[PDB]
Amino acid sequence: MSTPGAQQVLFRTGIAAVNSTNHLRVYFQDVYGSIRESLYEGSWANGTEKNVIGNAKLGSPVAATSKELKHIRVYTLTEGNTLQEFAYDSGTGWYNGGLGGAKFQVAPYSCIAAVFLAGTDALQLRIYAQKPDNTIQEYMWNGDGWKEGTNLGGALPGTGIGATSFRYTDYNGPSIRIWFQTDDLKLVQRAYDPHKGWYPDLVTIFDRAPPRTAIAATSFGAGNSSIYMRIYFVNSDNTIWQVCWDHGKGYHDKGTITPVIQGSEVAIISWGSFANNGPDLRLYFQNGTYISAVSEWVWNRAHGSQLGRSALPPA
Ligand code: NA
């Protein structure tokens, strides 16, 4: 009922994913603590011992962001509970990124979210993690080196963190949205727009979620003061739930998506738009396929919601 390859995947591994349209990369932790990359270039590949991009503390969070597949950054925790980065650039390959040298100390139970800021060719990064005082701290890279950005206040110790960046087509700079769990177990959004900065208000997206539930988010289809967003978390029913932001409706359409193992982590990628025979969504999680394999859920225009690849490489 398992496979040799499935047995190599850590149960409740952190999961992250990046893409350029339907060209996909998925990152996960093996049972030895190595971070591996599985890939989709027309078919699923890799995820083996030969596809290791670095090592992290066992049980580390795993976050990733990209500029198409030209630049990829993967964030995890060291054994010393400092932030670290595995970097890929086209023409260079993989290397140990400069974030680790800053030795930013976070809570041992911190999660991580990461985004490249949208709508610029410049490489601008925002990383979100939880300090020992349980506050959410932004870390920035704007070409001058890593610096602390805005502190976004208290959250539940060990909260999941989701993040997305998009640029409205009528705006002169990028927007950011992040989601986390507060000390009262609610799920909330914080928001950055270039005229308002960080909005003061925490917007509740779900009234009560399991403590330290996984949180993952995406955005797509930016237009003139318009955006679409999807947030995923693991609910008390041992399923992933989806919360939708749709332009002109706001937050609505909250409901279950797919069952998962107790304590599954979650990753989401998206591409395209309602306007051009999209969008496409791909969700990654553990649902007990081959016990410990990572599985995929798909949304597309052709067939809507359905389970995708049942067991990613190496399973
Ligand atoms: Na973990």
**Is residue 282 situated within a structural domain?**
yes
CA distance 15 to 294: 9
**Is residue 114 situated within a structural domain?**
yes
State the distance from the centre of ligand 1 to the C-alpha of 309, rounded, in angstroms.
23
Place of tokens 């601008």: 124
Place of tokens 């859920």: 297
Which residues are CB-neighbours of 196 under 8 A, at least 6 positions away?
none
State the distance from the centre of ligand 1 to the C-alpha of 164, rounded, in angstroms.
21
Q: Is the dihedral of CA 9, 155, 19, 73 positive or negative?
A: negative
**Is residue 315 situated within a structural domain?**
no
**Is residue 263 situated within a structural domain?**
yes
| Structural domain containing residue 182 | 6-307
CA distance 33 to 76: 11
State the distance from the centre of ligand 1 to the C-alpha of 13, rounded, in angstroms.
6
State the distance from the centre of ligand 1 to the C-alpha of 205, rounded, in angstroms.
23
State the distance from the centre of ligand 1 to the C-alpha of 267, rounded, in angstroms.
13
CA distance 287 to 284: 10
Q: How many CB atoms lie within 10 A of CB 19?
A: 18
CA distance 178 to 203: 11
Determination technique used:
X-ray
CA distance 5 to 47: 9
State the distance from the centre of ligand 1 to the C-alpha of 81, rounded, in angstroms.
13
State the distance from the centre of ligand 1 to the C-alpha of 136, rounded, in angstroms.
18
| Binding-site residue ranges for Zn(2+) | 244, 246, 252
Place of tokens 């110790």: 157
| Binding-site residue ranges | 25, 37, 44, 73, 85, 94, 98, 126, 138, 146, 150, 177, 189, 198, 230, 242, 244, 246, 252, 282, 296
Go through the chain and tell me how many residues it has.
315
What's the structural domain count of the chain? 1
CA distance 133 to 222: 35
**Is residue 256 situated within a structural domain?**
yes
Query: Do 287 and 259 form a contact (C-beta atoms < 8 A)?
Result: yes
State the distance from the centre of ligand 1 to the C-alpha of 172, rounded, in angstroms.
38
**Is residue 92 situated within a structural domain?**
yes
Query: Do 58 and 33 form a contact (C-beta atoms < 8 A)?
Result: yes
State the distance from the centre of ligand 1 to the C-alpha of 141, rounded, in angstroms.
26
State the distance from the centre of ligand 1 to the C-alpha of 313, rounded, in angstroms.
20
Question: SS3 letters for the chain?
Answer: CCCCCHHHECCCCCEEEEEECCEEEEEEEECCCEEEEEEECCCEEECCHHHEEEECCCCCCCEEEEECCCEEEEEEECCCCEEEEEEEECCCEEEECCHHHHCCECCCCCCEEEEECCCCCCCCEEEEEECCCCEEEEEEECCCCEEEEEEEEECCCCCCEEEEEECCCCCCCCEEEEEEECCCCCEEEEEEECCCEECCCCEEEECCCCCCCCEEEEEEEEECCEEEEEEEEECCCCEEEEEEEECCCEEEEEEEEEECCCCCCEEEEEECCHHHCCCEEEEEECCCCCCCCCEEEEEECCCEEEECCCCCCCC
Place of tokens 């997206």: 205
Residue type at position 167: R
Question: Which among 28, 22, 107 is positioned nearest to 63, based on CA atoms?
Answer: 28
| Binding-site residue ranges for alpha-L-fucose | 25, 37, 44, 73, 85, 94, 98, 126, 138, 146, 150, 177, 189, 198, 230, 242, 282, 296
**Is residue 251 situated within a structural domain?**
yes
State the distance from the centre of ligand 1 to the C-alpha of 60, rounded, in angstroms.
5
State the distance from the centre of ligand 1 to the C-alpha of 263, rounded, in angstroms.
9
* CA 145 to the chain's CA centroid: 23
**Is residue 182 situated within a structural domain?**
yes
* CA 146 to the chain's CA centroid: 20
Q: Which CATH number covers residue 205?
A: 2.120.10.70
State the distance from the centre of ligand 1 to the C-alpha of 59, rounded, in angstroms.
4
